[PDB]
Design a protein around this ligand. Structure first.
Ligand SMILES: [Mg+2]
Ligand SMILES: [Mg+2]
Ligand SMILES: [Mg+2]
Ligand SMILES: [Mg+2]
Ligand SMILES: [Mg+2]
Ligand SMILES: [Mg+2]
Ligand SMILES: [Mg+2]
Ligand SMILES: [Mg+2]
Ligand SMILES: [Mg+2]
Length: 113
């Protein structure tokens, strides 16, 4: 779905149902949180950046210009939670929140349509 132009973010109709049954890398993906911790954001001109961290560790996340961020400087983000806005890659959610997560995401993301 969609077409390469400026910022076309999601995928509707059957096109999507295809992108869902067939595990695929959405056009406008959403970087998930491999780590369940707290949020931190930065200012510099070119690229934004969201950092998740626990008393254990922190992870750097590259969020280029188009990425509209759902999360804010401050609260917790469970593993595989949406840190970018839009679509998620099942494989990633598989690795992050688990199978049960992907499974549960697939079903519900499909019925959405
Ligand atoms: Mg545009
Ligand atoms: Mg759209
Ligand atoms: Mg549309
Ligand atoms: Mg403490
Ligand atoms: Mg990176
Ligand atoms: Mg808020
Ligand atoms: Mg609050
Ligand atoms: Mg488990
Ligand atoms: Mg749900």
């Amino acid at each position: 779905t969609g077409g390469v132009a400026g910022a076309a973010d999601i995928t509707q109709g059957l096109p999507r149902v295809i992108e869902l049954f067939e595990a695929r890398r959405p056009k406008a993906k959403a970087v998930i949180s491999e780590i369940d911790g707290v949020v931190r954001i930065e200012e510099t001109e070119e690229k934004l950046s969201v950092f998740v961290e626990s008393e254990g560790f922190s992870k750097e996340y590259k969020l280029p210009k188009e990425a509209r961020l759902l999360v804010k400087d401050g609260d917790y983000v469970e593993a595989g939670q949406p840190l970018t806005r839009g679509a998620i890659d099942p494989h990633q959610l598989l690795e992050a929140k688990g199978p049960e997560a992907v499974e549960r995401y697939l079903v519900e993301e499909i019925q959405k349509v």
